[PDB]
């Protein structure tokens, strides 16, 4: 009754979810021209079934987005009972506001695209802004990496009871403040000026940079230096979405990080090769658990505060 | 060609907007049962015209929302060319995210309700979150009180060049940093720890509390006391939306606020009587200008910076 | 698999339906500001479930309507399998036509609001006009109080075999005529003139005023006098929706009514206090029965001609 | 800028409307197979224009409805600025409610069909029920033959000042009372009792049967006989829509009707031949005027009262 | 859980499908005025059920289309779980493109009509163009008569291993080419010139005209002559949709056809009377099989390449 | 009033269109991460204007499609009066049917994506299938290169009066027959038999290969060889869309083609360098003219025939 399909080419995160559910991934033959025009042929019947399409990648976002959208459509047109998009890292999520300029809210566009494509339900992790849920009329489940992050912290940082959770930007205050209270520790905010400033005591404490996403890593690297200047004994960085475009890993090796921790929301195998500082938290259990519970009609909320 | 109608009973802000445009308000007969069931009858032909309904109030939020929605329907059903909702303060704007519980996203409900009522375009001021624009498929113009707020600070606060802009909660971080930078001054945050802390220096300087909206005033009140304990010379409070429910007036009079600044986004004549500390920035010119420029096809974006 | 939630504060009619189904009402925490801005947090998981939200009240129609709309939304966004609005008295139902004026068809607006909010199905009683069903694209079940009214008549009025069913207005002719034929008795119509006239023999017969709704009661009280002037031995009034705004009960005690009968579609406990003439028919069995049968996939039509 | 097209084969009413406006009808080539499959080709550019398709007929209601729908599609698909459906008689208008059975609401289907075909606005005369306006989300203008009907009565019925306006069924109560009041005269109702009664006095006066539409004429025929038995001097019959199927003509000739009044909402030249009693009120001026004023942005509401 | 209703009056194809499924057809009372205005009353409850409405006919396409649309609506409004339109011959299917003229794409209109009427799923046979599937957002299953046609060929034409599949028009090339490869034989195309030309060797071979549809038969009759002139020993014609308007059967008897084969997608009983050349393939097994499998959630694709 | 924007990096075709109209292109700042996440900021006010976004490219089809979609959103969200997509080559146009497998209809996805992005109208050239127009509810103008192609043949091919127009697959039958007739010459088809045949005579005459689009060129290449074996004097190849991936250039240089004709629907400057045989028909005048006439309200249909 339940079927899991993998988009992209990285069937890694997909397979783990499949394994944890006692299932194999559905057959998909995918052809691509030099145009990167994507052809999909669902290798098996999904009529009357509860279909889950997992999208992992974020290396070529437009190819990946279109591949997902095409698959959703193929399944919806083949009489699937329900089509759920499992998008651990939500594409164009940083484009959720106009910011005083004639910009698109591309995250709303993407949400409209997923909707008009045939998605009935969305399972995602750590929306860049929670308000992105409101870009849908279908239900969205926004899972938190926090519980697993909270857990990683207590087990890997001896000093966690005396640390400071730091936000690298002004927008991330609520997240770090929500984590700092749970752990019962200090918080601190960094803000890049529109002409980097830190607010909060970080002195003689290990500082933990927490954000939902890292990309070029300019921000976290600069915040790392800034924190050490402020008297932090060491700096960690925990981010759920580790995009790591180009220079990011050269920068991670150059900056004084104890470790940069991410979830496998995005494939990290190749990056861990040329970067020893990177550690990965496996979030496939949470996803597998969201899927299993969506299909059974159980509470997926347990996953908001339990691993 | 242009037509301006007032929802509510508070002709207050609408009349000024009609004035700045050399217009009178359209004839409306609105009848209300003891039930509060709202009857509306448009007293002239809107056929083919550019309709602007101004909803000012926030005293009975469900009443005023229904009144506005019904007026939109009536106009759209009477062959209006365009129907534009002028909502200086967007109702249910705080409810823009689930926030880790089985809660509704009520600001998305409102957006959908306005849309299905026949809204073509929206004009509003300081959306509690920028991403609410994304809750629509119709164009949204979100104006800023910021210029008028910067203007006020510089001209009414002698010590402003060395003040600290303070966010009463961790949510308004982006807001105070943007003001703090434009004014090239310091920021600081306050946070109620889930069992009240201050990050950033405020000592021997004036602190300005900046928030988008206030209601009961409890938060800005306990924030002002924390600020006073931290050695701020004096505390100001600037809000673009001044709801001021129940205890707010006394609490504003009793607490240490130098002054309390609001806009006439929400009627403030009654509150002025019982409270001397309050200053009101008239925003009718900005709104009037957004209307003139929506109708003409001109750049309302100039209003993001020019008073 | 089935869950019942109560909106409003009057959990009375809700509980009875819950009892008749061997169920308890779902947990809902509701917060309201002085603004009457409504916050809802569904206290339990509704994922995959068949959710029924009962709305009773009609005292503050806009608060009640918004509370319902918010709850529907909360449930739809929490992955409910189906959300059914159980609205015994349909709000703004009297606003179902333009009536030669620039009015809204607010009943259509309300229907659009319920739709865009996430309702999948509607269960209601005695639509002011049957055509309101057509304001939806979702299915609507319009239950009739008639069977229970027919029953109340045969059991409480000794003379029922020789009575006259009277319509207080020209619009209610079809209803009273449908009831008069069943019982095998006379009908009679009243009409207020646009400068009160009765058509039909009422002489030496007990007259029964039948309408779907009573409010201020001006109409039924004036019709009561008119009927007695016409030679009616006594006058009853049976109405399914007993709003009873302000003066209505002072008027009921003043006019020569034998009894005014309503259904508990609207809470009558407080009104029966200062009014002895008021009697209530319990319609919770019909509603409980509509719900039980919607969820099981049985015929709810039996309830159109059986109690 | 304006463009008027005729659906059907009955150029009859369209040509007059085009005349009153100083316009010729747009070139249409419509081809029909023995199948009655309708082919339509627009014979000139409608790109950027205000299109008005006039559908007059009601001889083969499915044919004429499809023809009209296809013409709308064609124009909307050829970049017409606006497409307006002129349907003097709204098809399936009687089917506006389930009426206690598993029936469709076909007038809501029609509304939806017209809308999804690309209709922007509707002009119609005497909707069988006002609430049908609610079946749309597009603007509806519903014109009245009433003024033209009042006008006719006063000028053609000598006894009119003491006549009785009679509704042939209980449904048309509101209709006859509105006419009866405007003329300051008596009303009366007729009802076929579900196993024919008259309520109201008609004795020694002329009775005018008023209904919105007639078809087979059985109802107005048995009504006229009841009226004659009740001692009406003479019986008139006034309908805005004269469908007149099969037996209608003979039955109108045989029965006692002084005259039978209709509008040219539906073609009446053929029926005039075989039936001398029939009088036709031309409504082309009213329709022509609704079009002129929809296009200009003027008050069509003046047509609710001014001939 | 599954219900089959027959539209039209031809309950023939409907009954066969019903028989093959161990089911009786649902009760439908249908009233029609001289107007051909269609009334439907579903004689039994369809609440929670999987409803299938079969439309056979194509004699009066607009009556048939409206009857279907009305039934879908009646069922959707009576709380059917799912409504599937089983339309063996898709109406207006030949109107799927603009063809360099201001025409409607009526097939898209029809698809929009079926959608807005309440259909959730479509089962059809041999779409005139496969692209018509894309006129929907609901799923469409386009069954092929080919497997049964392939079978009929091997069993009724001794020479099938040496025949030529001929397309009567340029648009039908893909179909005949797909059939010619399966059988492992030649193909040939005919094209009527815009001032009839054949491409391909037909000499000393039995030629088989294959198209999806035949109507007046002008085309196939003219192609038959043309093929015999080209040296074909005999000519067959296999078409899935045998409309056979007026002259078609007089023409079939006059032209040198060995046999004209159609499916009973359209009623052929009356036409086989005055035409001996006509043979019918029963496709009720394929349809019954599509229905049975849609409802069970099995693969209906087996029916694309198996009888 | 008019505004022309260029999507992509290929200002190539847009600039010419802007030239032919006496316009400059609107200011756009588009920023792209290594991710290929597309950021777009409109550099001037489009409020109230007629927007035309030109998307030329087809080098990275997902990139260019996303870029175009985002630009549409941005403009529609900035109060543009109308947004029109100019897509000379419609992306995913080949995927217009399931074709007997569980495939998506990706050209319908694209249509839906463009629509939900805020597209009001579309201008395109030679849709791979006419029925794709049906995939929209918005107006589509589908222009032909045909006149420009006929023009080219007559003027560049000496032998044209006795040439044969050849379709490289069985799909393009309609295409080559339409050209063959207009030119009053012969047609012929080629077909790869599913285990390459030619139907129609080509011997001792020039064969022109006509197709709508080519990519790898394999099909037109094996077609040219078949044609050469059949005794065509020389082979030409005419395509309206010249994608030319990977091996296409060498294969065009090595194979026997006299010349290869394309339009500048897709950029062709790079391909010209490495390939001498290629001729390009500039279509900027046709597109420029469709824009001028969409904006003015003029007949773009004249472009179906007049160069």
Swiss-Prot record, chains A, B, C, D, E, F:
Keyword set includes Metal-binding: yes
Pathway: Metabolic intermediate biosynthesis; 5-phospho-alpha-D-ribose 1-diphosphate biosynthesis; 5-phospho-alpha-D-ribose 1-diphosphate from D-ribose 5-phosphate (route I): step 1/1
Keywords for the protein's UniProt record, in alphabetical order: ATP-binding, Charcot-Marie-Tooth disease, Deafness, Disease variant, Gout, Intellectual disability, Kinase, Magnesium, Metal-binding, Neurodegeneration, Neuropathy, Non-syndromic deafness, Nucleotide biosynthesis, Nucleotide-binding, Retinitis pigmentosa, Transferase
Family membership noted in the UniProt record: Belongs to the ribose-phosphate pyrophosphokinase family.
Effect seen on changing residue 50 to H: In PRPS1 superactivity; no effect on Km; resistant to inhibition by ADP and GDP
Pfam families hit by this protein: Pribosyl_synth, Pribosyltran_N
One GO cellular component term: cytoplasm
GO biological process: 5-phosphoribose 1-diphosphate biosynthetic process; hypoxanthine biosynthetic process; nervous system development; purine nucleobase metabolic process; purine nucleotide biosynthetic process; pyrimidine nucleotide biosynthetic process; ribonucleoside monophosphate biosynthetic process; urate biosynthetic process
Protein name per the record: Ribose-phosphate pyrophosphokinase 1
Gene3D superfamilies named among the record's database cross-references: 3.40.50.2020
Quaternary state and interactors: Homodimer. The active form is probably a hexamer composed of 3 homodimers.
Coiled-coil ranges from the UniProt annotation: none
Domain of life: Eukaryota
SUPFAM superfamilies linked to this entry: PRTase-like (SSF53271)
Impact when changing residue 112 to S: In PRPS1 superactivity; no effect on Km; resistant to inhibition by ADP and GDP
Catalytic activity line of the entry: D-ribose 5-phosphate + ATP = 5-phospho-alpha-D-ribose 1-diphosphate + AMP + H(+)
Cofactor requirement: Mg(2+)
Regulation: Activated by magnesium and inorganic phosphate. Inhibited by ADP and GDP.
Function: Catalyzes the synthesis of phosphoribosylpyrophosphate (PRPP) that is essential for nucleotide synthesis.
